């Protein structure tokens, strides 16, 4: 059969009858306006469905149109620069088709429009008669100037090519590839439909070795992240969250970005949806907009609670489809604390047992089964590509306390934590990443890259970490007894720590010279500031005063280092100027 | 989209248990259908259908279930869900919680029939709030200023004057003079007879009822009408704003009496009570009436909300002010400390915050010193409250000449700036001019949060 009838609605939940061949967690369309809901129980012929939309005016006997699939995304061209909700309805098309400001509760508008034409070209290896496995790229759609949309096979099916398309412009409904198999020949277009709860298959997990060049100086040096890794940041009101989310989209080596705003707010999501279309990317030629490589999943809390719980799985499935092409995806879940409040309402409506602070029993397992979808892996398919997914999930704990069933379960799964602080924003220290509470566990896998490319960076930062760790025990005694009892060895390492927090860590994002500090500038700005430290370690073992008053101009040359603009200043000049500062310190001592 | 079929009338009541009336042999019942009960002695009652199952439909009667028979009562099914007669001539009328007029007037002529549940606003169509809403209170306009589309509660307690400053910011709300299509929808849920009489006789006795749409709902009103009261008030405020293009302020007072009515009907549907007795879907249900705010892209209208709530026992970890602080954008505390000290309004600005006040104030909006005089009055208030704790354990003599100036600022800040009186309508310019008369008692170079580019123009007077 194909139709069911309603037989009773008691709120969001509909106990639809006459549905015998219905599967569990399969999406249906309830009512005359076709409200979307999923089958959540199945008692014989009746199927108990909870509706995503608002049931109001749904009669007994309305048709329940079965689809036959779980909650799934449409993967194909027309996705870059598009804004979806958590269940992938196009917000930029709903506001254009209907000419209104509301979501009309019955829109089964397709996520990818079937009216635009895409310039398709085949892989030029595939002929009529070739055997093809799942994951093989059989075409490339030049979607933008930046992104080449490699049309791939679905991982499910397999067969032999009997009809390939000629090079030309097609819709997303035109048949492009046709595959003979044992029983029946299958034909399918450029769009593939993959369930969002199902992990994408892949050949082999690889270890993560290459770092993410985020652009900031404290994050690329002291607490480094790898592409293929999982991080976490505190999601407070204002510490630094707007510039960590936007410098990682402008100034990173990641090929595509997916930004998942997951039930955020009314005006805090309208701020994001109007600031990301007006960002600018500096590619090797001319300037470009960031929305040629960025997709957004936008959810306010007026939206359905199951379109807020499945926003994370929509975002990670778009991040995994662009991983399998060979790109290096970076995904930022804007809030995972507002996602776990969408689990508590889903489980609280099903009368599930609360585990801890109201959250359900499967909270720590659903967070682990999402963060373990991130990693640099070797993709499927005979073209022999590799991809990556990096996940930056922000956590907004109640009251800023790190003891919570979501926050303490995030810190046990993520490896990197960039601890943003409220107090460093009140002292105008930008970016406000704290160094004591932060950590990074990818350092042991990043030495093999650092010994082949920079080779004087690994012992450089461990000296910079023990200086600032020494400063916190020195800060309690400067008000206790004072600097009058402070040692000649300890008063110098306090004075280079103030040089560290002013020159290396503090980085103004609106100045045109420090918007993107590359790692050649980053290794230079610390190698001339740690070499200043240990030559000041033997200068007290031979006077603290005469090194501060006579080298005050050398104190200025380190305090105008961050100014050595690398956009308009060559790399080899900056290396040349940094070597000249190294000789001035070795000659003055 | 008219419907012309005649309505059916059932005398097939098959069960009454509490406020629910269970019918039988119903021909294709809708879910949220509005029915009209007729008692055996002729009295009329209304009711929403609560749950259907086959041919059985369970209605719940609004006005109560007493006297309802099983043989002689007749229930009539109006074939559509609850609608609202909206107009622009509902500006100056007093309605009850179900939409009927109270102020001895006629029914509204219904220039549109709108749904009370509405639809969610598109996140791609919403735009960021920019200009300011003048409330007339210096503690709100000066230091915790609200934008045009900001959602900002008033965290009060039982006994504190949150009804007296709700009626104040309704009589004297305007945009900014700036030398214009303004309306106010006031919804009261769970008020007394004395508070409802105070709200009726303060708006009509002050000339403010040319732009106020007042929705009362008393505590002796049906508890199902407390749920459709903020849905009526925000349906009309979505007709005045971005359908008639006027800036609307919605004041939803006693949002702790709304969720005590939401808990009441959640036990009528036989649901298990969640955290602290409140239902599990209260974050979705509160956010369906808060997120009907903000500005849209193609229309000049705007709608901003001040949902006033009373947190019990001065608790922020209660689910009523915790699930409100997650979705609204900064809070305003009415506190018992300043209220016993006889300061009206008793709004302490040290824990209060407006998250979008950096957008609301500015040069083209109010004037260009609002950002610095708000930061300087807040910094001098924290010091003057800190050194007032030094006045008791150290002494009035041993403190320096600086700390004796902060103590003279403290007795003038909480008496000239915050303490206003219930009928003093200060503009946004009269607020900042009082804000400079309290900063002029300090010498400059103590005013360290104000830059010298703005300290030179406004200090010497």
């Amino acid at each position: 059969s194909t139709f069911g009838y309603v037989h009773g609605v008691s709120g969001p939940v509909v106990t639809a009858c006459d549905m015998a061949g219905a599967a569990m967690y399969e999406l249906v369309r309830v009512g005359h306006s076709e409200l979307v809901g999923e089958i959540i129980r199945l008692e014989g012929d009746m199927a108990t469905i909870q509706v995503y939309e608002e049931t109001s005016g749904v009669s007994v006997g309305d048709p329940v149109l079965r689809t036959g699939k779980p909650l799934s995304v449409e993967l194909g061209p027309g996705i870059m620069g598009a804004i979806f909700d958590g269940i992938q309805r196009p917000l930029s098309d709903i506001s254009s088709q209907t000419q209104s400001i509301y979501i009309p509760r019955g829109v089964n508008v397709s996520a990818l429009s079937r009216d635009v034409k895409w310039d398709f070209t085949p892989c030029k290896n595939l002929r009529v008669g070739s055997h093809i496995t799942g994951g093989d790229i059989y075409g490339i759609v030049n979607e933008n100037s930046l992104i080449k949309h490699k049309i791939m096979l679905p991982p499910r099916n397999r067969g032999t090519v009997t009809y390939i398309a000629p090079p030309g412009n097609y819709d997303t409904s035109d048949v492009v590839l046709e595959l003979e198999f044992e029983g029946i020949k299958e034909k399918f277009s450029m769009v593939q439909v993959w369930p969002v709860r199902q992990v994408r298959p892949v050949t082999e997990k690889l270890p993560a070795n290459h770092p993410l060049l985020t652009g900031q100086r404290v994050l690329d040096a002291l607490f480094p992240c790898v592409q293929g890794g999982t991080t976490a940041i505190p999601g407070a009101f204002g510490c630094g969250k707007t510039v960590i989310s936007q410098s990682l989209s402008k100034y990173s080596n990641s090929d595509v970005i997916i930004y998942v705003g997951c039930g955020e707010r009314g005006n805090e999501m309208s701020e994001v949806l109007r600031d990301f279309p007006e960002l600018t990317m500096e590619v090797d030629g001319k300037v470009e907009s960031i929305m040629k490589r960025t997709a957004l999943v936008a959810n306010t809390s007026n939206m359905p609670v199951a379109a807020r719980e499945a926003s994370i799985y929509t975002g990670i499935t778009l991040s995994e489809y662009f991983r399998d092409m060979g790109y290096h995806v970076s995904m930022m879940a804007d809030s995972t604390s507002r996602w776990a409040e969408a689990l508590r309402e889903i489980s609280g409506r099903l009368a599930e047992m609360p585990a801890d602070s109201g959250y359900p029993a499967y909270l720590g397992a659903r967070l682990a089964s999402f963060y373990e979808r991130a990693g640099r892996v070797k993709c499927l398919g005979n073209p022999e590509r590799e991809g990556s997914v990096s996940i930056v999930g922000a956590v907004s704990p109640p009251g800023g306390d790190f003891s919570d069933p979501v926050t303490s379960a995030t810190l046990g799964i993520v490896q990197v934590f960039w601890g943003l602080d409220k107090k460093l924003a009140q002292r105008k220290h930008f970016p406000s990443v704290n160094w004591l509470i932060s950590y990074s566990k990818y350092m042991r896998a990043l030495d093999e890259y650092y010994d082949k490319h920079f080779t004087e960076f690994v012992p450089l930062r461990t000296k910079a970490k023990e200086i600032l760790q020494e400063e916190e025990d020195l800060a309690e005694i400067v008000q206790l007894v004072g600097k009058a009892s402070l040692a000649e060895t300890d008063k110098i390492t306090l004075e280079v720590a103030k040089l560290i927090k002013d020159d290396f860590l503090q980085q103004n994002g609106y100045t045109p010279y420090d918007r993107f500090c590359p790692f050649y500038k980053t290794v230079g700005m610390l190698s001339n500031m740690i070499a200043f430290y240990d030559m000041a370690r033997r200068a007290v073992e031979t006077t603290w005063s005469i090194i501060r008053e006579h080298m005050g101009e050398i104190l200025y040359k380190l305090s105008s280092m961050k100014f050595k603009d690398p956009v308009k200043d060559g790399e080899a000049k900056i290396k040349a100027d940094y070597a000249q500062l190294l000789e001035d310190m070795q000659n003055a001592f | 989209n008219y419907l012309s079929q005649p309505r059916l009338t059932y005398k097939t009541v098959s069960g009454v248990n509490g406020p629910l009336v269970i019918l039988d042999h119903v021909k294709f019942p809708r879910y949220a259908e509005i029915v009209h009960l007729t008692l055996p002695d002729g009295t009329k009652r209304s009711g929403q259908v609560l749950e259907v199952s086959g041919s059985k439909a369970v209605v719940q009667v609004f006005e109560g279930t007493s006297g309802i028979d099983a043989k002689k009562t007749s229930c009539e099914f109006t074939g559509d869900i609850l609608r609202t007669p909206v107009s622009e001539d509902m500006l100056g009328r007093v309605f009850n919680g179900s939409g009927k007029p109270i102020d001895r007037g006629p029914v509204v002529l219904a220039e549109d029939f709108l749904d009370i549940m509405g639809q969610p606003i598109n996140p791609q169509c919403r735009i960021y709030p920019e200009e300011m809403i003048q409330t007339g209170i210096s503690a709100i306009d000066g230091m915790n200023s609200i934008a045009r589309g900001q959602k900002i509660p008033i965290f009060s307690a039982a006994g504190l004057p949150h009804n007296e400053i709700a009626a104040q910011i309704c009589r004297q709300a305007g945009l900014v003079k700036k030398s214009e299509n303004f309306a106010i929808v006031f919804a009261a849920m769970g008020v007394n007879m004395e508070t409802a009489r105070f709200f009726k006789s303060d708006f009509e006795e002050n000339g403010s009822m040319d732009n106020v749409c007042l929705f009362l709902n008393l505590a002796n009103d049906p508890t199902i009408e407390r749920i459709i009261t903020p849905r009526l008030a925000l349906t009309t405020a979505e007709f005045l704003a971005y359908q008639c293009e006027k800036h609307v302020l919605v004041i939803l007072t006693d949002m702790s009496s709304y969720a005590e009515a939401l808990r009441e009907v959640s036990a009528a549907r036989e649901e298990v009570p969640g955290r602290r007795g409140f239902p599990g879907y209260m974050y979705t249900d509160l956010a369906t009436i808060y997120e009907r705010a903000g500005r849209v892209e193609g229309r000049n209208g705007s709608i901003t909300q001040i949902p006033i709530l009373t947190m019990p026992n001065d608790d922020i970890t209660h689910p009523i002010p915790d699930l409100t602080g997650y979705i609204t954008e900064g809070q305003i505390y009415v506190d018992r400390q300043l209220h016993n000290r006889q300061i009206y309004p008793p709004i302490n600005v040290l824990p209060s915050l407006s998250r979008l006040m950096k957008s609301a104030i500015g040069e083209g909006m109010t004037r260009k010193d609002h950002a610095d005089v708000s930061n300087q009055l807040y910094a001098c208030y924290a010091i003057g409250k800190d050194v007032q704790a030094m006045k008791a354990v150290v002494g009035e003599e041993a403190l320096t000449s600086d700390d004796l100036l902060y103590l003279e600022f403290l007795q003038k800040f909480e008496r000239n700036f915050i303490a206003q009186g219930p009928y003093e309508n200060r503009t946004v310019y009269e607020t900042l001019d009082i804000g400079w008369q309290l900063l002029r008692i300090f010498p400059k170079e103590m005013l360290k949060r104000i830059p010298q580019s703005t300290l030179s123009e406004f200090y010497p007077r």
Binding site: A351, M353, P354 | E270, V272, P273
Partner: peptide, 19 residues
């Protein structure tokens, strides 16, 4: 929560007999 969900499971069974 466990005592109230135990009763709402028992009240459903008694309403499945009286059908």
């Amino acid at each position: 929560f466990y005592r109230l969900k135990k009763i709402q499971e028992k009240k459903k069974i008694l309403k499945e007999k009286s059908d």
